[PDB]
Amino acid sequence: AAKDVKFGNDARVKMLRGVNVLADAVKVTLGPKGRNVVLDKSFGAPTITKDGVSVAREIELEDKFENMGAQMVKEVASKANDAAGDGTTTATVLAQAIITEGLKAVAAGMNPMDLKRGIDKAVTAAVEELKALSVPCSDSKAIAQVGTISANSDETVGKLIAEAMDKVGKEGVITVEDGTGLQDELDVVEGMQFDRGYLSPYFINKPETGAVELESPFILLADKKISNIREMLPVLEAVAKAGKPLLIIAEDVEGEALATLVVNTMRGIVKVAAVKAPGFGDRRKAMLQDIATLTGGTVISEEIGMELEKATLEDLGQAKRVVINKDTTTIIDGVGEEAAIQGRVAQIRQQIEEATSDYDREKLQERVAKLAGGVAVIKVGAATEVEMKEKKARVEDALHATRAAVEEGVVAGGGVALIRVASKLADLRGQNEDQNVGIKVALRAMEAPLRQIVLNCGEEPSVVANTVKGGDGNYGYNAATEEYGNMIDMGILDPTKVTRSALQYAASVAGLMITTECMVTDLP
Template identity: 55%
Template sequence: MAKMIAFNEDARRGLERGMNTLADAVKVTLGPISTELSAMSKPVETKEQISATASISAADSTIGEMIAEAMDKVGKEGVITVEESNTFGLELELTEGMRFDKGYISPYMVTDTERMEAVMEDAYVLICNSKIANIKDLVPILEKVMQSGKPLAIIAEDIEGEALATLVVNKIRGTFRSVAVKAPGFGDRRKAMLQDIAILTGGTVISEEVGLKLEAATLDLLGKARKVVVTKDETTIVEGAGDDEMIKGRVNQIRAEIEKTDSDYDREKLQERLAKLAGGVAVIKAGAATEVELKERKHRIEDAVRNAKAAVEEGIVSGGGVALLQASKKAFEKLKLTGDEATGAKIVELAVEAPLKQIAMNAGLEGGVVVEKVRNIEAGHGLNAATGEYVDMIKAGIIDPAKVTRSALQNAASIAALFLTTEAVIADKPEPKPAAPAAPGGDMDF
């Protein structure tokens, strides 16, 4: 679509005439089309709809079904990650509770040597926003926990020196069970995640910034969890004892931060934190026969997960380029534009035909004929390229996330506007292909 807008003949002629407002004129149409797309979208209410959306994106119904299953288990705000597997096929692994990517500091803390895990049942959780090295700072709270008879999970910036040695020696002797884990993240993000853990477990972050010192810590500052499982690389906190209202408040706070941020990276990290508190974590493990096939399959699954989440966020619309074409028709019928704006609208009107035209051409049909037919048939109906029939697209399971359709249009217009207002573009010159070598014996006489 960006190409159709930026390199349209009307756009070129307009710029030659000095029509510098053409880029703005193109953008004028975006709002009305987006509004029509929103009006067309239908909320995703069933597991089957999520499966259909993901299946189309991944071109694989098995992948679609697994993504729908994962979203059903962890909720719309849960995290779904995709990992490479050494085994062939697909596998879904669900994690209850909060999980973060930090493991035990010392393998001597392992309680299950077969699985190489440190498992703490009905444990206290000490959360500290500083390094712990001096055993004198740790002894007072250790004595209190030992008297309770419960194990202790320590999450701190770092645990080292004699403090770590004391924990290891007590574990080996069977005097006291504990596990030490480095806090996840860095800087302000680490502080925020420690606070998340504290709220989830009903504890308090011990930090000198708020006047709390480790040597003066009491049991009521510690969090609690039904189970803490720590591996070499990950820590999972199951059923923290945090107050439901406080957890809900923290979740709402993170949601507000997601709305405010302009950074995609920050938004992604905030969504991960939100999922750890409000949803859960699902891991789809993908395997394949070759390395190349594995990478390609993993990327398809990741794209399908994003599309499924987008469908849940803003609903679904008819796929196959139908929604875009029919939404633009409705929008342009309502717009009364003149001059440059009318020219910009005409350019966009032609550009939104591109996806459907391409689908028709791929199916061996005449693009222009298909576009004209779809533009004038019942709303929501379009071409099923697999059968060549015109059907109700949503009923036939040919759907797209409304968010993806809207974003595609906005991104295309943004890129095109950049080209239209650019004086010059620097591009790599294609290298000439070397001539094919002469056939052996080509100069010999026979």
């Protein structure tokens, strides 16, 4: 593959022109008065989005060098979304700022490797100062606040997350799905519930709605699919002699085994229900042990020294009540030690830290929430499918933000935190004169986010930056109300993590990026 090489200011400029494109395209979505971008998709109708990394991911340039530039800054936006879920635009805006003033500094002839050392040092300091400005976010008031801001001033969304986090606890999981009507809807499930139906419609008890109810039943668990015919008599015969109902959770139940269970329950011999296991293998098998230890039963596996025909009443689990409908199965207050239950959650703590990243965290906490806490699901409503993609995207941002705000705390929004930490670091110096510039470049660049928000309002950024920098603490500019005031009192909150993350990531890549003396790529 024949390559093409460029040097010096020639190459830097080509790179910069590319970066500016990715950045200038992301910038328009910043802040409450920030605007929307349309991304063309071959697949279906276009996508309208205010989410920065969403726009960033789609940017690709024809000039190989400009492309390289943009493709490099596209990473700072992406790394933010995989970490925080908010601040992608903020992080991207910071990244651009560092590089512009940075590359300008190289044109001054200053040594770049020294410039990076200065920046990284200034950045390290700024993070510490942020750890200082960080105040804990606890009350559902603050939760609604960080949520409302990250949602672009949707108070319903903010209020919705605070309720969800409040009802199911901090361990409760929350998911975002497409809506039916035009209204947002909050669903809450307490206790253990998974999605599967009764295998035969004939299992319905007295209650209508297709509800099957079992009071103080026996639960049975199989690692394998049942099928055959009758199978398992000793366990069923023991439950019949016992005087209680049985619940069966297996890989599946084939028609022969189902029929014989149906005939016995129809005639009235023994009250019985049988339901399919939660998921495909290892999803299912893992969630039996979650389910097994909750109800104090023992999982019967073909992979160990036990089998279905040999079973004891002790292998069975017990619960107060169980409810099964066409799509759902529920276990009301099953009986297992709090010791054993907390044992399974503690084992998932080791499961919390993984290499799987996203979707690993969604399905892992899902098991945990079901075992201890409860689940919350938010249904986003819309008139049309394109508004749905916008509403749900604003909801996902707000969800990650509130979660992040909860754990790592909050600082004043409006990017005023960065502009404040920059004011605190003013007396900072480096090893050499060149390193000093790298430090100063960073502080000037921490102004960028605030100065960008104002510009999106079409107002003089120069004036607002001045009038905010003249003051101290949480005094800041409200872009929505277009008036100054206390950021914290006005409910404008940045999860500290998203602000910290945006700053760190942009500096890392931009620091490396201004060190470029050459660029190699494939020929057109």
